[PDB]
């Protein structure tokens, strides 16, 4: 239509214009969410501990020139400021321990670990902690497109072998991406005290260009050699009593010691889509240069005003929308008045009327911290957003009289001010000014509010508690912390094995516990590092292959338990669904219902007639498989025998449910005509073969000593008694029948006419059988095959041994039965295969329930095979997580 295609074109044009403008807006500006943080400040770990706790009051400057390092004392310190090779002021904080490292955890030789700058070791530890404290499993980041944009300076070297010593103190240490396996750009910048800040800027651009998904931004220092403390002492810049005073009556400019800080940034939309946690938003930054000033190292006010206005313009905001500013303190006699005047000129000029611009500085409480200073300021501001309080330390009362402190709306943060949420969305700003002459400004904003959640659990509902990643750490010892890191004052659930970041793939060691009452971890599992346990699975896996091949067994005929459990029928929905489906399929041919017999309801038939025993077991077995497959365990080579051949075929997909059910019932009914006419014998093959010669009457070979031979009527009982006069492990035999024996006869061909109705299909995975010691194939099954199954001998142990050395290997014989009956009992070490045999069981013969199945799965989770534990916990939320222990001294070549 002439009047319609034009309208369609107009609509397409309008939609494209809207999309293009939205894309332009996204490209030129885009909020960036901060996901996680990690820090290592001198005296204590990170986040709360070394923060909202210490920042409430302050302190620091513990002095104590370190003694662990070489650092010849009694010579650096001298009262004379003009002494040639000494330095005054012996105060100044320092890290508690800088020579600590784990080495073996990250896979580095101790020789190479010794020749390694402490900055790299601390950076590795802090990066792992940062990734951990984000709800993201570190092992899943492999192969992604995350990059590192950090800033690090070279602080001294070892003045005292085929490699290293030219690569460890190489400044450009992007080996974090090497160990973790990242693919984003790796950059190490250096722009003096502001380096971290400008580093951050670069990351933002990449996050807006689509070349990286997440970014890691931070800085570090170690102050290995005395170094600076001497040199600046010769410049008369550093002053005694090194407590730096910002905007007060002192002038020190104290060069405080080391500190490591890292943060993780991601685009806000991606964070919302994936479902991470957002703490604060970055929405603008600016960088510039002081230009031609009155000296190489001298601040310039006009440059600071220009950069502040540029940042405000880039954010698209107004100067009156910022409530608190963190200043580049660096308490000296000249920088503070200049910074105060610049702030008054740019943020002043009738700010509100009554609202003053609060001003503070972290360095007045923690020290300069060298290159990682600026990012450290962030670590303050964000916490102020998460606690509704401004941590105003500012340990100085009398303000600087040089600057016109009064007659303005910029009030120094003398005490403490409430910072509660509500109207007028909170915003803050940080700034940094380097020695070289580069200035940076950044604006941050509070995160949007989305916190509703729900409450669940508190029922019985047994919950797995797979260990907090017993890992490559020393195969021992570290279990200790995992034993004690799980101390619950008042909480519940806390799914650790869930997608929660703590996963760590349980690198090699692994362990498990299943309960619903209390902790019980301080029990045997705790002392498992030096003792044993009672009812908890302990594994020494080596993750030979992370994903093992899977095979199932399906032989029954002897389980005959007293009711195949009922609590799992009521609790597990998939089991009940499969049971009901099988009952419906078998309903229109026989009157009995498998569910009624299973529940042991009144009127149910006894477990004596075969016509009930044989089908019911079948109806159970397939269902068990449906449970296992429901947990991500996909078999490949089901090899079950006897009456379970048909069950394996159904699992293999070669048969339909109703066809298998009708075959089972017909076979049982036709066999029922024979009773009290046969019986096998349970035991050396050659011995019984040569001994049974005087009798004209073999059934199955379950092993070297578990061969089941075909027998005869009660004369076989006399022969068994004669053998019981000897040893030869004479045992008993089950209900009378003569299967796998020529004594069947009777109907014979009558079976083929009655049982021939099938439409066999190609096997989905594999249908390896025991009658023929080779893999079968689909559409090759006929009534004659099942006739010979009941007539010919069973070759089970030989088939198992053949499969043991087969290509799939994987020793994952599961045997999903209501009984153990695992007569194989390994018997695979003499099969030229590997040694990591699993041969796990299934639902317990007597104590079988949902908890028993969970215990069996945990005992299966040993070695390599993996399951998805999240299925067992429908509806939950991650809680919290600690980190990895056990550093050791390396001393970094003191002599």
């Amino acid at each position: 239509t002439d009047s319609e295609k034009v309208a369609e074109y107009l609509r397409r044009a309008t939609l494209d214009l809207r999309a293009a403008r939205q894309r332009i807006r996204e490209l030129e500006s885009d909020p960036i969410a901060i996901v996680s943080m990690a820090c290592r400040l001198p005296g204590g770990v990170n986040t709360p501990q070394r923060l909202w706790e210490l920042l409430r009051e302050g302190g620091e400057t513990l002095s104590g020139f370190p003694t662990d390092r070489g650092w010849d004392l009694a010579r650096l310190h001298h009262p004379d400021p003009d002494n040639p090779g000494t330095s005054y002021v012996d105060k100044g904080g320092f890290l508690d321990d800088a020579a600590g490292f784990d080495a073996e955890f990250f896979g580095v030789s101790p020789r190479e670990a010794a020749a390694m700058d402490p900055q790299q070791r601390l950076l590795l530890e802090t990066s792992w902690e940062l990734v951990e404290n984000a709800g993201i499993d570190p092992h899943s980041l492999r192969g992604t497109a995350t990059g590192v944009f950090l800033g690090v300076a070279k602080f001294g070297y070892g003045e005292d072998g085929y490699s290293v010593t030219g690569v460890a103190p190489a400044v450009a240490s992007g080996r974090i991406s090497y160990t973790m396996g990242l693919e984003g750009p790796s950059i190490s910048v250096d722009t003096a005290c502001s380096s971290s800040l400008v580093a951050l800027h670069l990351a933002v651009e990449s996050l807006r260009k689509g070349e990286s998904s997440m970014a890691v931004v931070g800085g570090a220092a170690v102050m290995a050699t005395p170094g600076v403390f001497v040199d600046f002492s010769r410049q008369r810049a550093l002053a005694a009593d090194g407590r730096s005073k910002a905007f007060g009556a002192g002038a020190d400019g104290f060069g405080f010691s080391e500190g490591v800080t890292l943060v993780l940034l991601e685009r806000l939309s991606e964070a919302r889509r994936n479902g991470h946690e957002v703490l604060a938003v970055v929405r603008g930054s600016a960088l510039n240069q002081d230009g031609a000033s009155n000296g190489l190292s001298a601040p310039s006010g006009p440059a600071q005003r220009r950069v502040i206005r540029q940042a405000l313009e880039s954010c698209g905001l107004e100067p009156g929308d910022v409530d608190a500013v963190e200043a580049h303190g660096t308490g000296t006699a000249l920088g503070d008045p200049i910074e105060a005047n610049a702030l008054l000129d740019t943020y002043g000029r009738d700010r509100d009327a009554d609202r003053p611009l609060w001003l503070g500085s972290v360095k007045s409480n923690i020290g300069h911290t060298q290159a990682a200073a600026g990012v450290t300021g962030l670590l303050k501001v964000v916490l102020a957003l998460r606690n509704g309080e401004l941590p105003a330390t500012l340990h100085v009362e009398e303000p600087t009289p040089h600057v016109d402190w009064s007659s303005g709306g910029v009030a120094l943060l003398a005490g403490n001010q409430p910072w509660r949420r509500g109207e007028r969305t909170r915003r803050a700003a940080v700034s940094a000014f380097g020695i070289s002459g580069t200035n940076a400004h950044v604006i941050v904003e509070e995160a949007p509010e989305r916190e509703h959640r729900e409450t669940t659990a508190h029922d019985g509902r047994p919950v797995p508690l797979v260990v907090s990643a017993r890992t490559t750490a020393a195969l021992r010892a570290q279990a200790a912390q995992i034993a004690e890191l799980l101390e619950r004052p008042d909480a519940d659930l806390a799914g650790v094995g869930l997608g929660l970041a703590t996963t760590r793939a349980r690198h090699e060691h692994r362990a498990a516990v299943v309960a619903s009452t209390r902790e019980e971890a301080v029990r045997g599992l705790r002392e498992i590092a030096a003792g044993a346990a009672t009812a908890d699975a302990v594994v020494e896996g080596v993750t030979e292959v992370d994903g093992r091949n899977v095979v199932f067994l399906f032989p029954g005929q002897g389980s005959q338990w007293a009711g195949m459990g009922a609590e799992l029928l009521s609790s597990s929905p998939v089991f009940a669904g499969k049971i009901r489906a099988c009952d419906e399929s078998m309903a229109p041919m026989q009157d009995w219902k498998v569910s009624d017999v299973l529940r042991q309801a009144p009127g149910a038939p006894g477990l004596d007639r075969v016509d009930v025993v044989q089908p019911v077991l079948f109806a159970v077995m397939v269902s068990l498989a449906e449970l296992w497959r429901s947990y991500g365990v996909e078999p490949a080579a089901v090899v079950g025998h006897s009456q379970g051949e048909i069950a394996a075929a159904h699992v293999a997909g070669a048969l339909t449910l109703e066809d298998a059910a009708k075959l089972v019932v017909g076979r049982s009914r036709l066999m029922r005509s024979l009773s009290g006419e046969g019986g096998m014998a349970a035991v050396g093959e050659a011995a019984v073969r040569e001994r049974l010669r005087p009798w004209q009457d073999v059934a199955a070979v379950n092993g070297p000593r578990s061969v089941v031979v075909s027998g005869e009527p009660g004369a076989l009982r006399a022969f068994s008694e004669d053998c019981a006069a000897e040893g030869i492990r004479v045992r008993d035999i089950d209900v009378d029948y003569a299967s796998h024996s020529p004594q069947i006869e009777r109907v014979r061909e009558e079976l083929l006419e009655t049982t021939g109705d099938i439409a066999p299909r190609p096997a989905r995975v594999t249908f390896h059988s025991t009658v023929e010691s080779r893999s079968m194939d689909g559409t090759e099954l006929d009534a004659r095959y099942w006739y010979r199954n009941l007539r010919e001998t069973v070759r089970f142990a030989d088939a198992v041994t053949r499969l043991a050395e087969s290509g799939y290997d994987a020793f994952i014989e599961v045997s999903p039965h209501p009984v153990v009956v695992q007569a194989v009992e390994e018997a695979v070490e003499e099969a030229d295969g590997a040694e990591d045999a699993v041969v796990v069981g299934s639902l317990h013969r007597d104590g079988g329930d949902l908890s028993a199945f969970l215990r069996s799965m945990a005992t299966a989770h040993v070695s390599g095979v993996d399951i998805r534990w999240d299925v067992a916990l429908p509806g939950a939320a991650p809680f919290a997580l600690p980190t990895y222990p056990f550093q050791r001294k390396r001393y970094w070549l003191q002599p």
Partner: protein
Amino acid sequence: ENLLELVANAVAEVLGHESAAEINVRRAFSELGLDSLNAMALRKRLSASTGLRLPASLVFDHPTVTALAQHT
């Protein structure tokens, strides 16, 4: 089986370890920490001790220490 201790102490010496016994027998060489010509140093140590040849493919033949039975 007697040369397992020889292999373990040679590995500890070439890797800078001092215990010569706290090495996971069933573990990959990369996890334990190894580089380029450390393999040829280990080969030289074995040739000095065992006197066998240097196929140079033993590292990739069996990274696990427990599979060091190829000697003699």
